[PDB]
């Protein structure tokens, strides 16, 4: 693998570790942990620390239920900013039912089982090189997050970046001292925006970083006086944070999507793939774009997709075939926002892909003119189905299709719609400040 | 207005984002107690005197704008879509035509020129309309195609394909389009003229050189 038992153990004694934190990820995505002391590292490795497991069903825990923690030896890491009275390490863990069996429900082990299905089809890997975007807001005397951007830079800007770069370097020159292989960082479209992109990786191995990232970014941004946030669309009219998911399937150590003397150097392997991701783009959006605000991002304009279709040159495409090819030949799914559970996204995404490759669905006409000039009628005319308008319509369709529900699996599916219609009724029963400024003097 | 502690200004577009003030003109000609624009048997119940007068305003329209909209600010009211008539075309309908032919007939039969604004000089303004309104009655001018479809939804270039030319964009773009028109000139008074052409360019040349903080939000910092 990567780290061995006697391997970890020497890293701790020499590095002087005084506190181990056992990370796993909840359903809404939230990276929660269960903290134990180096004194108990042994029973932790032995896969024997139990814990109330419904901490995963989020704010829909019905019953306390004992579960285990099987820590991956490779997801091991020590923390630098916690480098004083005994640095403070963290692993990432495989939740397992009490008897011996994996937890059906664990977001993570669900990607591994949507991954088993991959091998059973012949592929050897899967790859995710995600570009995650984030605003950096200033805190205050008190320490509260305000609505004041950290900067006023724009696309790829320089001198203005410095106030948020002063951080973007701090963030990026620490992840290196964390083991990361960060491809690179620039500055995004609207002010305060920023984006760092790292090296692709295997599904699990990567989402493992997704989580990590979101966390080291906020840890380091607060240690600067600002509040890193990943809201899809935090400010109105201003551009939203996204988190594109460049994918690529391998099969025996070699890019399956690559094909030299083929229409667009594309294989009849990547076509059926694009075909599938075009065949559930509206029914996996609940998962990919899972919150109520993720739909204030998907408004035509700010580069965010709004309609289903693909190309290799387009304003806001649902799919996007990066041009570089070979071992880099990839499909970029641009709708996924950083408010999406890494794990469950890769699930509906590699499952809507592998229902094409098998069934052999056939991809549609890649676009080039405009899907913005023909209304909702002249568009729902040629297999151009707009992505959902609200979490709620987003759920309506998610339930509507079998292939997906089987993609999470009864327990995960059920608690999710469950955890998510709740999120919807509150926001729907709520009266906001807008509804008020409007109608108070007109009515 | 003051009496009630407020301020009242007939300024064309005091506030951006916000509609400007349009002092619309309803025009009607008679010849012996009887409305001349009017006509029982005819299309749009409109006498030829009218189509004749119409082609008039539609011709010189671009020109007397320097006199119907004389301020530096006046060109920021005539932006697209605030109902400001940005294009030279007549109609009894449309987003915002330069000329609107009301529906009342009988003696009200009339021609409304909405180009004109409250910060104009009522009299001059007026002598230039009666002006192009008459070149046309006299040289028997041919009215053009009233605005059906709508031209807003068009390039400046497909419109240009119809007798449709925009309105001046700046108070400077106007003045010159005024100087080069022989009938506003002789129309105003060779004196009222030398002093108007002039009085404004200077106005323009004073707007033109200042450094408006706008540019500072814009350049002070970035460059």
């Amino acid at each position: 693998a990567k780290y061995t038992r006697e391997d970890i153990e020497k890293l701790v004694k020499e590095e002087n570790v005084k506190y181990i934190r056992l990370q796993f990820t909840d359903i809404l995505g939230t990276i929660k942990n269960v903290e134990i002391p180096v004194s108990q590292l042994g029973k932790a490795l032995d896969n024997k620390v139990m814990f109330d497991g419904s901490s995963i069903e989020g704010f829909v825990r019905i019953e306390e239920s004992d579960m285990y923690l099987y820590p991956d030896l490779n997801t091991f890491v020590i923390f630098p900013w916690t480098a004083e009275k005994g640095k403070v390490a963290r692993f990432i863990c495989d939740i397992y039912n009490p008897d011996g069996t994996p937890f059906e429900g664990d977001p993570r082990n669900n990607l591994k089982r949507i991954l088993k299905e991959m091998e059973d089809l012949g592929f050897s890997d899967f790859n995710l090189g995600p570009e995650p975007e984030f605003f950096l807001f200033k805190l205050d005397e008190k320490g509260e997050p305000t609505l004041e951007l950290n900067d006023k830079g724009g696309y790829f800007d320089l001198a203005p970046t410095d106030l948020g770069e002063n951080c973007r370097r701090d963030i990026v020159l620490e992840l290196e001292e964390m083991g990361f292989e960060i491809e690179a960082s620039h500055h995004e479209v609207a002010p305060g925006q920023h984006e760092i992109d790292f090296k692709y990786a295997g599904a699990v191995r990567s989402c493992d970083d997704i989580q990590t990232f979101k966390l080291v970014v906020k840890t380091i941004a607060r240690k600067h006086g600002l509040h890193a946030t990943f809201m899809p669309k935090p400010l109105f009219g201003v551009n939203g944070s996204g988190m594109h998911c460049n994918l690529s399937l391998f099969k025996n150590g070699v890019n399956a999507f690559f094909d030299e003397n083929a229409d667009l150097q594309l294989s009849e392997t990547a076509k059926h793939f694009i075909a599938g991701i075009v065949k559930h783009a509206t029914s996996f959006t609940a998962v990919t774009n899972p919150t109520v605000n993720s739909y204030k991002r998907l408004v035509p304009g700010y580069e965010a997709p709004c309609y289903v279709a693909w190309s290799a040159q387009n304003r806001s495409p649902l799919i996007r075939i990066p041009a570089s090819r070979g071992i880099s030949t990839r499909v970029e799914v641009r709708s996924v926002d950083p408010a999406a559970n890494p794990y469950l996204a890769l699930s509906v995404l590699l499952a809507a892909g592998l229902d094409g490759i098998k069934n052999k669905l056939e991809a549609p006409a890649p676009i080039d003119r405009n899907i913005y000039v023909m209304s909702k009628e002249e568009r729902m005319e040629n297999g151009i189905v707009d992505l959902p308008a609200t979490l709620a319509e987003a759920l309506e369709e998610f339930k509507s299709n079998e292939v997906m529900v089987k993609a999470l699996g009864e327990h995960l599916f059920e608690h999710f719609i469950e955890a998510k219609e709740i999120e919807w009724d509150m926001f729907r029963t709520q009266v906001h400040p807008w509804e008020r400024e409007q109608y108070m003097s007109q009515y | 207005a003051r009496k009630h502690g407020l301020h009242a200004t007939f300024m064309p577009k005091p506030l951006f984002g916000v509609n400007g003030s349009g002092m619309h003109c309803n025009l009607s000609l008679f010849k012996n107690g009887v409305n001349a624009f009017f006509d029982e048997n005819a299309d749009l119940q409109l006498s030829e005197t009218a189509k004749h007068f119409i082609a008039g305003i539609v011709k010189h329209a671009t020109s007397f704008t320097a006199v119907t909209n004389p301020t530096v600010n006046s060109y920021k009211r005539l932006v697209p879509g605030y109902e400001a008539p940005c294009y030279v075309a007549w109609s009894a309908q449309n987003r915002s035509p330069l000329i609107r032919i009301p529906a009342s007939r009988g003696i009200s039969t009339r021609v409304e020129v909405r180009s004109v604004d409250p910060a104009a000089n009522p009299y001059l303004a007026l002598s230039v309309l009666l002006a192009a309104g008459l070149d046309g009655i006299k040289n028997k001018l041919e009215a053009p195609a009233p605005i059906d479809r709508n031209i807003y939804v068009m390039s400046k270039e497909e419109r240009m394909e119809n007798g449709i030319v925009d309105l001046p964009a700046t108070l400077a773009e106007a003045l010159e389009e005024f100087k080069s028109n022989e009938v506003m000139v002789k129309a105003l008074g060779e004196h009222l003229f030398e002093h108007f052409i002039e009085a404004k360019e200077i106005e323009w040349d004073m707007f033109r050189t200042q450094v408006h903080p706008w540019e500072r939000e814009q350049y002070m910092s970035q460059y």
Binding site: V189, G237, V299, G301 | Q218
Partner: peptide, 15 residues
């Protein structure tokens, strides 16, 4: 509605 992204892009480039 690249015009809104450009509308997104330009409202900023310019304020």
């Amino acid at each position: 509605k690249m015009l809104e992204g450009q509308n997104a892009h330009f409202r900023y480039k310019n304020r």
